[PDB]
C-alpha cells in the first residue's frame, strides 16, 4: 500500500520525460534540428524533411 504512493510519483514523471525525448529524434530526417535542415538543403528538399 506504500508502493502505490511512489508509483504515482513515477507515473507523473514518466509522462514528462516522454515529451522531452521526442525532440531529439530525427524520424528519418537528416537531423533533429530545423536550423540544420535549412542550412544543408535547398527549398524543394527542405519541405520534405
Amino acid at each position: 500500500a506504500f508502493n502505490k504512493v511512489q508509483d504515482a510519483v513515477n507515473a507523473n514523471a514518466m509522462a514528462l520525460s516522454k515529451l522531452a525525448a521526442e525532440l531529439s529524434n530525427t524520424f528519418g530526417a537528416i537531423s533533429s534540428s530545423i536550423s540544420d535542415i535549412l542550412a544543408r538543403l535547398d527549398t524543394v528538399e527542405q519541405e520534405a524533411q
Binding site: 529524434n25 530525427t26 524520424f27 528519418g28
Partner: protein, 48 residues
C-alpha cells in the same frame, strides 16, 4: 386506514450475471515484430 396489496402466492426467480475478472496476458517481441532480424532495418529504428 389504507389499502395494501399483500402476496398470497410466490415463486423463486433466478437472475444470472457474468462479471469479468481477468484478460489474456500477452508479451510482444518488439524487435522481431518490427524488423524481423534485418540489420538495415534495425539502424533505421534508432531514429525513432
Amino acid at each position: 386506514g389504507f389499502v395494501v396489496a399483500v402476496p398470497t402466492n410466490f415463486t423463486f426467480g433466478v437472475t444470472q450475471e457474468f462479471i469479468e475478472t481477468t484478460i489474456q496476458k500477452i508479451t510482444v517481441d518488439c524487435k522481431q515484430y518490427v524488423c524481423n532480424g534485418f540489420k538495415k532495418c534495425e539502424d533505421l529504428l534508432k531514429e525513432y
